[PDB]
């Protein structure tokens, strides 16, 4: 009907309808969304987080690492240390 009212009815119910289904929908798409933004977010928080745990972590690996470099380090200081103890 071309003569139907096109304006919105302000007399519609403005309150939230409690009879809406409170159960979560199983028909929601379970696949990952490729249309999500792949760019890094510049609006993230650049400040440090004091809420991070300040306590030492006991779950760190206590075993000696075999993947440490076994070759000698040429970048060590070749100069004789003047701060070595000069006493007897």
């Amino acid at each position, epitope marked *: 009907d071309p003569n139907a009212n096109p304006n919105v009815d302000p007399n519609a119910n403005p309150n*939230v309808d*409690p*009879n*809406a*289904n*409170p*159960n*979560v*929908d*199983p*028909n929601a798409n379970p696949n990952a969304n490729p249309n999500a933004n792949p760019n890094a977010n510049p609006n993230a928080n650049p400040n440090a987080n004091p809420n991070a745990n300040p306590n030492a972590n006991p779950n760190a690996n206590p075993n000696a690492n075999p993947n440490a470099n076994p070759n000698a380090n040429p970048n060590a200081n070749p100069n004789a240390n003047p701060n070595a103890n000069p006493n007897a």
Partner: nanobody
Amino acid sequence: QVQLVESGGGVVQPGRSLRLSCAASGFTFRNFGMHWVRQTPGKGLEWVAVIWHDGSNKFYADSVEGRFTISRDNSKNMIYLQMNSLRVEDTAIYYCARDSLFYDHDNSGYYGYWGQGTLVTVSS
């Protein structure tokens, strides 16, 4: 086995605060919305509150609007009902009820599973 157990009942004085807890087991808790149902002798059953699956929306009855607070924690599988400023009219048995037997988009709002209920009485 959808087993619902209320707790935290007792007797309090008017104007004080009471809290009811409801431990739910036997189903995926975070997939369904729960209710609280109140049974007053001489009046019948009356609805109290409802909460969404993830705790987004909360709706209360007129008689308990603004005085009762419903909440949930999907991690311990519990439903809570905080009752502030209790009055003599709030003496009844409170039931922990689940909405629907199973998911149906067009059919929701009926209590498919009830708890045994807890007694809450206020007096001096």
